[PDB]
Amino acid sequence: NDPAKSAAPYHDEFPLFRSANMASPDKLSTGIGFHSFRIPAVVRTTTGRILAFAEGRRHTNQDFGDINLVYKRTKTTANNGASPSDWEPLREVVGSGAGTWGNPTPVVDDDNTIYLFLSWNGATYSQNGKDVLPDGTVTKKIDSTWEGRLHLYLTESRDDGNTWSKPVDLTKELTPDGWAWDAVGPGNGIRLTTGELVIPAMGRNIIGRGAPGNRTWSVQRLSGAGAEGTIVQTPDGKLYRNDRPSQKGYRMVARGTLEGFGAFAPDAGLPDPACQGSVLRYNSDAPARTIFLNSASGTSRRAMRVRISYDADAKKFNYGRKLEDAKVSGAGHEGGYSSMTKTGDYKIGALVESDFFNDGTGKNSYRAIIWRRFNLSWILNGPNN
Ligand SMILES: CC(=O)N[C@H]1[C@H]([C@H](O)[C@H](O)CO)OC(C(=O)O)=C[C@@H]1O
Ligand code: NA
């Protein structure tokens, strides 16, 4: 029932963000390097250029301390990132000593303005507090003070990702008062058939209305949403939140419109180990498809599975295909956060976290990011369907 299964299967994959332990580790032009890269996000722009974002975690793999927001672009608008030589060297969206810049959540607007929502916190604060920094300082716990809370920032590019504006703090506008912890995405926002932008965040969606690249933002509060959410517009044109659960088990899904959402409920078809996932609107003509990617396991992040739903409301996803069927060598053990885009040559492009595990669950375990391309035929020709 899917003509794509008859096309020749295609896959290729290679490390795109190379951690400090690897040959040719990724460093900025300034010489600044990174122990680990985590928290991927990818979008294809209106030109066809692909922009890949990540957190550059300077000294360890930990969520706190000196973390910068880094990126790579495809060298041209037409190369579709097919091989390592198609990608530019590492660049920086925003960096700094005193800050923790993370949670890249991009969305491409009609005018090709690429918006990138981001989180910021102080480099001396952490989620739990009392964590040890490289210099032996102990962090303070994230709190509701201006200095100590998670901020929500916005930067954009008007030149196809070549340069980025100094990020603007939108916390007072788009984060509820009295909040301490926060998250936006991470992964991506979307543009609706009806023209609005929707960016998933902790307990809310951020809605963009008005002129492309000159949007008015507002907050849609959600009941029972997760901290790390994904959003897609399903074939029926409705909205679909698919969120990381607070405890290991299953993805938490809710459906709605810009007028409001129904309740979140576990999707028993989508096991999840309490980790971020990604979702992608593929096409609208028969057969319409939504793509989903996470670790398909209640316990482990190393069960990465890409799936297709043919449902108008994405009610059920197929078994799909295990990413390990096309394993990458020399970049650690694949599994974790992910982000997906369509490419100009009819593939799906996916960024996927990978972990060398050289320090076990400890702070010195190097983390890299894999770039995969595969077509629908590759997914559909999986042996476990
Ligand atoms: C530090 C931060 O801003 N987000 C972190 C997030 C958070 O701790 C919470 O558990 C999610 O809801 O979890 C993870 C994780 O790999 O599990 C990575 C993120 O960097
Ligand atoms: Na930083």
- DSSP string computed for 272-340: ESS---EEEEEESSSSPEEEEEEE--SS-S--EEEEEE-STT-------EEGGGGPPSSS-EEEEEEEE
CA of 35 to the centre of ligand 2 (A): 13
Residues 6+ apart with CB under 8 A from 147: 122
**Cα–Cα distance for residue pair 315/235, rounded to 1 Å:** 11
Residue 39 Cα: closest atom of ligand 1: 20
- Atom number, ligand 1, closest to the C-alpha of residue 246: 12
Q: At 38, phi and psi to the nearest 5?
A: -140, 170
Where is the binding site for substrate, in residues? 38, 57, 63, 127, 244, 301-302, 310-311, 316, 337, 355-357
The closest-lying atom of ligand 1 relative to the alpha carbon of residue 103 is 3
The residue whose CA is least distant from atom 4 of ligand 1 is 63
Give the residues across from 55 on adjacent strands.
Answer: 38, 69
Gap sites in the chain (C to N > 2.5 Å), preceding residue numbers = none
* CA terminus-to-terminus distance, the chain: 14
C-alpha span between 150 and 24 (Å, rounded): 33
Ligand nearest to the CA of 246: 1
Both tokens of 300, joined, read 């482990």
Cα 203 to Cα 144, 181, 227, 273: the distances in Å are: 16, 11, 6, 20
d(CA 55, CA 153): 15
Tokens 């303005």 sit at which residue?
Answer: 113
Q: Is 21 in the pocket of ligand 1 (CB under 6 A)?
A: no
**Alpha carbon distance 141, 127 (integer Å):** 6
Ligand 2 centroid to residue 379 C-alpha, Å: 38
CA of 106 from ligand 1 middle (Å) equals 18
Atom number of ligand 1 nearest to Cα 150: 3
DSSP code per residue over 119-134: EEEETTEESSS-PBPT
Q: Bridge partners of 231?
A: 241
Residue closest by Cα to atom 12 of ligand 1: 227
Give me the residues paired with residue 307 across strands. Answer: 292
**Rg of the chain on CA atoms, in Å:** 19
Annotate 45-70 with b (16+ C-beta within 10 A) or e (fewer). beebbbbbbbbbbbbbbbbbbbbbbb
Instruction: Give the whole-angstrom CA distance, residue 364 versus residue 153.
Output: 29
Judge if the beta carbon of residue 102 lies within 6 A of ligand 1.
Answer: yes
Ion ligand 2: residues, CB < 5 A? 66-68, 96, 99
Q: How far is the CA of 267 from the centre of ligand 1 (A)?
A: 21
Integer Cα distance of 208 and 213 in angstroms: 10
Q: Which method was used?
A: X-ray
Distance of CA 114 to the CA centre of its chain: 15
Q: Tokens at residue 253, please?
A: 């899904």
For residue 305, the CA-to-ligand 2 centroid distance in Å is: 32
Q: Which fold has domain 1-385?
A: Neuraminidase (2.120.10)
Please tell me if the CB atom of residue 180 comes closer than 6 angstroms to any atom of ligand 1.
Answer: no
Residue 380 DSSP code: H
Q: Whose CA is nearest to atom 5 of ligand 1?
A: 63
- Please report, for residues 136, 220, 286, the alpha-carbon distance to residue 337 in angstroms, rounded to integers and kept in the order given: 29, 25, 30
* Ligand in closest contact with the CA of 126: 1
Mutating to test ligand 1, I would choose from 181, 228, 300 the residue with most ligand atoms within 8 A of its C-beta, which is: 228
Number of the ligand 1 atom closest to the C-alpha atom of 226? 12
Closest CA to 69 of 42, 50, 91: 91
The atom number, within ligand 1, closest to the CA of 228 reads: 12
Closest to 57 in 3D by CA, of 382, 380, 366, 371: 366
Specify the DSSP class assigned to residue 8.
P
Q: How far apart are CA 385 and CA 253, in angstroms?
A: 23
Ligand nearest to the CA of 56: 2
Torsion of CA 284, 291, 251, 237, to 10 degrees: -10
- The residue whose CB lies within 8 Å of the most ligand 1 atoms, and thus the one to mutate among 53, 63, 175, is 63
The closest residue, in CA terms, to atom 20 on ligand 1 is 63
Q: How far apart are CA 299 and CA 312, in angstroms?
A: 30
CB 253 within 8 A of CB 265: yes
Give the Cα separation of 188 and 40 in Å (integer). Answer: 10
β-pair partners for 265? 253
Nearest listed ligand to the Cα of residue 68: 2
Q: Find the ligand nearest to 102 CA.
A: 1
- The token duo for 247 is 């405890």
